[PDB]
Each structure stands twice: as C-alpha cells, then as structure tokens.
Design a protein around this ligand. Structure first.
Ligand SMILES: C=C[C@H]1CN2CC[C@H]1C[C@H]2[C@H](O)c1ccnc2ccc(OC)cc12
Lengths: 213, 218
C-alpha cells in the first residue's frame, strides 16, 4: 500500500526551541495530509488536516507545510504540554496509512545513574526463588547497556529489564533490572555484580556484593 | 462537545473471540464515518476498517478481512468491533475515531477515543508475592518493594497511604512465562530510616489483594 515514512523516531528539544517533524510519502498525496498528537497517557487528538489547516480550537504556535511527497509540521515556540508521540497520515487513497511515529524529549545535561543493588530477601529465598535486583534511578540518555557478571561471567538467562518513560519532574530516565535464579544456582556462586555501562564517563558504575558478607 | 467512549480493558484466551465497543455522544452518530485502528508497541498504527452507522456498510482491510467484524447500533449510539481466532499478534490496544466531513467524508479524522487495550494468554487471576528490598548499611539511601507472579494488570503501589511522593520510581511491569512482574523505588536520606517507619502499600483489585509491607534490613 502507500508507505508513509517519518525521518526519525525520537527527538530532542527544549522550551521555545522551534523544531519540526518531517513525514515522507511513498508517492504523491495531493496535499491530503493530517497531523496527530498522542500523549503517553493514551489520549490522542488532531492538530492539522490538509497539510496546514488548523482544527477548530488549537493554538497558533502550530502550523503546517506540504507538497507532493515531503511534508512537515512546526512549532515555532514549545510548551511543556506539547511532549508526546506525533503521527501523520495520508488521505489520498486506501487503505489509510500512518507514519511510524516520532516521540519527543527534553535535552539536558548528561548524568550518571544512582545505582543500588539488592540481594534476594529471606522471605523469597525460602520460597525457592532467588531474585537479585538492581535499580538505576535518575539518569540521562536512555541508551544504557546492563550486564551481570557472576563470578566474573557474562549472563543473560534470568534477567528482566524495565524502563520508565521520561520523568515529568526533571526529565530523567530510570531502569530496573532484576536477575532471577533458583536457590541451587544461587548457592553455587558467590560474587554478584550489577554493571551499568553508560556514556557519562568511560568508567562502568559497578555495584557488587558477596553472599558470604 | 463531542466525545467517544471506548470500552474498558479486556482480555481473553487465544482461538476465542472478543467484542469491543465504542460509544458516541454530542453529534449525529448516524451520519458520520466511524473508524477503528490497531496500535502495537514496536510499530505504528494499522488501519483495520471503517463503517457508516446509517446503513452500517463496511470497508475492511485486506490484512484483516475475515479477522474482524464491524457492527453499529443506532439507539445506543454505539460502534462495535469483534475479533476472532485470536493470537498473541492480536495482543494490542485498539482505538475508535471519527472521520470529519458530515455525509461525504474527508481526508482526515477529527475526534478519537481513549483506546481499548486487549491482552491474550492462557492464564488465571493470580495475586502477587510482595517482597522487601533492603541493602546491608550512606548519606543518601534508596529502598523499594518487589512484586512477582500476578495476573492481570494493573497493580497500585503506595508508600504509607501515599504520604510520600518524592524520588519515587514505580517501574512498569514486564513479563515472564505468562506472568507479570515489576518493582518500585523510594528515596530518603540516611537519617529518616531505619529510624522511622517506611512501608510500601500494594493493591491488586483483580485478585482483590490488599497488602502493606514494612521493610527491614538484615
Ligand atoms: C471507507 C471509507 C469511506 C469514507 N470516505 C468517503 C468514502 C470512503 C473513502 C473516504 C475518503 O473519501 C477517502 C478516500 C481515499 N483515501 C482516504 C484516505 C484516508 C481517509 O480518511 C479516513 C479517507 C479517504
């Protein structure tokens, strides 16, 4: 069908920083384009139809521009409420197709995470389970690589990672990794480490612990 | 003015069929093209079909032909969607949205619903097993509470009746062998605790499971 394509997937901008999204159609669409906004809280509304026609009841900071294939949408002045995933769509032929989406984010200074490792509590350790947790709170570029080197040995089978969206308070990310084992395996290795390789400083922040201690 | 009210979160087993719902209000329901959409996380939006309530004539998509089925009742001012022969690929969140242009239509949509989430798996309502997280003391310290082995979502997490609300990070739930699992963090200075009470309050209305938990080191 008609393949829409946005130039990116995630962006970076601060308050007032005039910025733009650029959609691209597989072919001509005769200026039958529309822009949409989807808050991470599920809701979704429209901004523009027909490349640059404002819907009844939207601010003049938004606008539009379009021709043939290369289309775009700009906000000459940003506000906190304008952070969301932004979609586009062609109204030329069937089936109606959308862009892959473009999420927004505030760009701020790099920051190392506040790591905190946690051995498996006793309440768990008697239930046969053996879960080792590692929190990584308040950090920037989401692009983190985490690894667990038990007795100094790379391992993946057992880990389950979780990521939070951009914090509405100070715009910083957090990660919650958690390695799961059975008691028998836990009771055969000693040194457990939660290594958090990050961009900020070459030094991998390590939070280790020995079960003999 | 105008509003679309999609049904709440719903789930069912694979192979079976589900009936969604999208109620309308504030405009002439009969004379407007109502559309549906499918949003999966990794990808964008996938057009699934549309309908004109007056005659209830349909326009599906080649990919979803025979898969979904659209209906529409006039008196209830409600739009419907029914999926069948389900698989994990259908596990997603669906939307309902109005096409502007009164009788003839147009090139755009104007108003949307809050979206209906759909999950599928062979599993049963299970309550979690809340476990405590303590280190083993610092200046500034982080604690937390871990849940595990519960179904279905969601699950609420508080800290002493929600008295706390700073430096908190309740992480979204992940999945292992068809069961949910998450965690949560709390932030305080070295003083506050263990010198003072610090408990995490959990709630899983599905299993009707209320649990409080004061955490202690070793
Ligand atoms: C099932 C759809 C019907 C509703 N509108 C009138 C007749 C049918 C077509 C569509 C519109 O003309 C239209 C034509 C071509 N391409 C379109 C692409 C998107 C779109 O927005 C719903 C409407 C389009």
């Amino acid at each position: 069908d008609i393949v829409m394509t946005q130039t990116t997937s995630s962006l970076s901008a601060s308050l007032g920083d005039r910025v733009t999204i650029s959609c691209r159609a597989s072919q001509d669409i005769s200026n039958y384009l529309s822009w949409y906004q989807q808050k991470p809280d599920g809701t979704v509304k429209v901004l523009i139809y027909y490349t640059s026609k404002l819907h009844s009841g939207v601010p003049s900071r938004f606008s539009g521009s379009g021709s043939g294939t290369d289309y775009s949408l700009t906000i000459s002045n940003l506000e906190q409420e304008d952070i969301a995933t932004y979609f586009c769509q062609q109204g030329n032929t069937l089936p109606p197709t959308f862009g892959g989406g473009t999420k927004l984010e505030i760009k701020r200074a790099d920051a190392a995470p506040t790591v905190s490792i946690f051995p498996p509590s006793s309440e768990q350790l008697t239930s046969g389970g053996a879960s080792v947790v590692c929190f990584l709170n308040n950090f920037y570029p989401k692009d983190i690589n985490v690894k667990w080197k038990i007795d100094g040995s790379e391992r993946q089978n057992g880990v389950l990672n979780s990521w939070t969206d951009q914090d509405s308070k100070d715009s910083t990310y957090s990660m919650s990794s958690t390695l799961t084992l059975t008691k028998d395996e836990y009771e055969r290795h000693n040194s457990y480490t939660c290594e958090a390789t990050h961009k900020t400083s070459t030094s991998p922040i390590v939070k280790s612990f020995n079960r003999n201690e | 003015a105008v509003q679309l009210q999609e049904s709440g979160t719903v789930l069912a087993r694979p192979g079976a069929s589900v009936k969604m719902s999208c109620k309308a209000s504030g405009y002439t329901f009969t004379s407007y093209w109502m559309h549906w959409v499918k949003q999966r996380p990794g990808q964008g939006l996938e057009w699934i079909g549309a309908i004109y309530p007056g005659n209830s004539d349909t326009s599906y998509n080649q990919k979803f032909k025979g898969k979904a089925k659209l209906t529409a009742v006039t008196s209830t001012s409600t739009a419907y969607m029914e999926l069948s022969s389900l698989t994990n690929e259908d596990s997603a969140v669906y939307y309902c949205t109005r096409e502007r242009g009164l009788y003839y239509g147009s090139s755009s949509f104007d108003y949307w619903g809050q979206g209906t989430t759909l999950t599928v798996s062979s599993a049963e309502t299970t309550p979690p097993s809340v476990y405590p997280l303590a280190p083993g003391t610092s200046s500034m310290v982080t604690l937390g509470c871990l849940v595990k082995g519960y179904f279905p979502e969601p699950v609420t997490v508080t800290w002493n009746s929600g008295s706390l609300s700073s430096g908190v990070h309740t992480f979204p739930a992940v999945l292992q062998s068809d069961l949910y699992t998450l965690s949560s963090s709390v932030t305080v200075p070295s003083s506050t605790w263990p010198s003072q009470t610090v408990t995490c309050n959990v709630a899983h209305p599905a299993s009707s499971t209320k649990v409080d938990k004061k955490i202690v080191p070793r």
